[PDB]
Amino acid sequence: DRAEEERIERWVEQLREALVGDGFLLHYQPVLNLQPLELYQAFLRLERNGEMMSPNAFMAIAEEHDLVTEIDRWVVARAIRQLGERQRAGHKTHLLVRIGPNSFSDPQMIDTIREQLAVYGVPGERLWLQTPESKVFTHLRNAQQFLAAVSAMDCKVGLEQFGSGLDSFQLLAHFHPAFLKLDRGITGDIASARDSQEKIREITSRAQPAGILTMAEFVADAQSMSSFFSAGVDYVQGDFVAPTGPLMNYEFG
Ligand SMILES: Nc1nc2c(ncn2[C@@H]2O[C@@H]3COP(=O)(O)O[C@H]4[C@@H](O)[C@H](n5cnc6c(=O)[nH]c(N)nc65)O[C@@H]4COP(=O)(O)O[C@H]3[C@H]2O)c(=O)[nH]1
Numbered sequence: 001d002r003a004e005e006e007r008i009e010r011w012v013e014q015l016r017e018a019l020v021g022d023g024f025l026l027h028y029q030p031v032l033n034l035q036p037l038e039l040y041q042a043f044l045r046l047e048r049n050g051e052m053m054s055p056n057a058f059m060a061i062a063e064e065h066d067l068v069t070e071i072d073r074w075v076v077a078r079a080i081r082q083l084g085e086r087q088r089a090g091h092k093t094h095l096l097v098r099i100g101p102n103s104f105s106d107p108q109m110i111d112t113i114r115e116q117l118a119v120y121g122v123p124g125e126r127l128w129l130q131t132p133e134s135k136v137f138t139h140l141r142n143a144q145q146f147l148a149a150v151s152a153m154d155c156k157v158g159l160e161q162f163g164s165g166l167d168s169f170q171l172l173a174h175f176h177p178a179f180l181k182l183d184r185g186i187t188g189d190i191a192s193a194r195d196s197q198e199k200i201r202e203i204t205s206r207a208q209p210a211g212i213l214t215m216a217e218f219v220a221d222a223q224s225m226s227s228f229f230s231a232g233v234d235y236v237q238g239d240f241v242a243p244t245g246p247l248m249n250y251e252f253g
Contacts, residue, residue, distance in 0.1 A: 011061045014048060019067075019074055023047055026078055030250035031096060031215070031237045034229045038252050039128075041096040041237060042079050043244050044071070069102045069109075077112050080127065084120025086248065093248060096128040098160075101135040104142035110149050117153060124154035128179070133159045133168065136175060144175060151178075158213070164199035169206070179213035182233075187216045190231070191223035197231060204232035 018024050025047060028040040046053040055062075062068050079097045086093035103109045117124055129150060136143040136159060147157050158179035162168060164186055186199045200216075207214045216228045219238030228236050242250055 008061055008064075011058055012065045012067070015046075015058060015062055015065075015067050015071070018046055018048075019070055024071070024074055024078070025246075026075065026082065027244045027246050028095075028248050029237055029244045030242045030252070031235050032241050032252070033234065034225075034236055035232070035234050036253055037094055038092055038248075039094040039096060039235070040248060040250070042075060042082075042098070044075055068100055069106055072099045072103050073106070073109050073112050076109065076127075076129075077116050080113070080116035080120055080122060083122045083126045084116075087120070087122060087126075091248070092126075094126050094128060096130055099129050099131050101131065101139040101142070104131075104139055104146040110146075113150060113153060113155065117155075124150075125156070128156040128158065130158050130160045130179075130181065132161045133163060133171070133183075134161060137167070137171065140171075140175065147175065147177075158215075160217075162203070164203060168203075172206070172210070172212075176210075177212060179215055179234075180207060181215040181217060184218050187218070187224075187228070190216075190227045191221070197227065200228070200231040200233065208232060 023046060025045050026042045027045055028042060031039040031041055044055050046058060062071055076097055076099065079095045083093055083095055099109065113127070117127065131143070150157055156178035158177040158181065160181040161183040162180040163183050180203065182200065182203065186196055188196070190196045190200065204214050213234045214232070215235040216233050217237050219225050219228065219236045220240050222240070225236060225240060
């Protein structure tokens with residue numbers, strides 16, 4: 001297990017070098033209104049010796065070695081720079097960015113948001129931050145504090161992998177997100193299954209009057225796209241809309 005630990009060590013070193021040396025980059029997936037906005041989701045990549053590496057390569061090591069906090073700060077800072085450059089170039093771009101629960105209590109994350117929005121002159125509304133519902137359940141106080149701190153900048157905070165149980169309804173009484181992205185477990189077979197269609201309607205019929213935007217992901221076909229619209233979902237993303245890529249060249253309208 002010396003060879004293995006040496007492998008782990010070199011990934012950790014590489015991730016540290018990527019933070020210092022700009023070795024990460026972002027790719028972007030368009031997010032389309034069903035019920036409009038220039039909106040993309042940021043996805044992280046690592047440029048390691050001619051390969052455009054996915055986080056499937058390294059995130060497990062990052063989490064084991066407590067590097068996720070710093071990686072999410074890197075992504076948010078890079079995202080705000082992108083929003084700033086896009087604005088300067090005449091584009092009203094919005095980005096959806098991932099943060100994990102360790103960021104909820106990280107003063108450097110709030111500092112990064114506050115300071116980088118300001119220096120690029122980007123209104124907070126352009127930045128949407130998403131975290132998995134599962135992590136809010138287990139870090140509720142800190143999540144509420146994060147929500148309050150970043151909503152003071154007009155940023156949107158929402159939940160991904162959102163479920164359809166009564167635990168979710170209870171959470172919404174205590175945590176008011178700007179948006180909800182449905183877990184793929186609910187939406188996978190929306191085109192061919194009635195119980196999925198009903199879970200989605202239970203969520204949209206509550207979300208809509210509460211002013212909470214709803215979102216579906218991994219949309220793979222036209223029948224699925226067509227069915228989210230019926231159920232009242234606000235936004236959709238997936239390879240059938242457009243795949244992740246390096247450029248923001250989607251024509252939204
Ligand atoms: N979410 C999502 N993904 C779609 C969709 N359509 C296609 N994809 C692709 O399918 C993969 C889904 O992985 P994930 O569950 O988002 O899981 C992600 C996530 O755990 C992590 N990840 C990716 N980007 C970030 C990031 O910016 N921050 C953090 N903290 N983790 C990230 O790496 C995993 C793999 O990401 P990728 O290699 O980029 O690969 C992504 C993405 O490129 C869609 O509608 N939604």
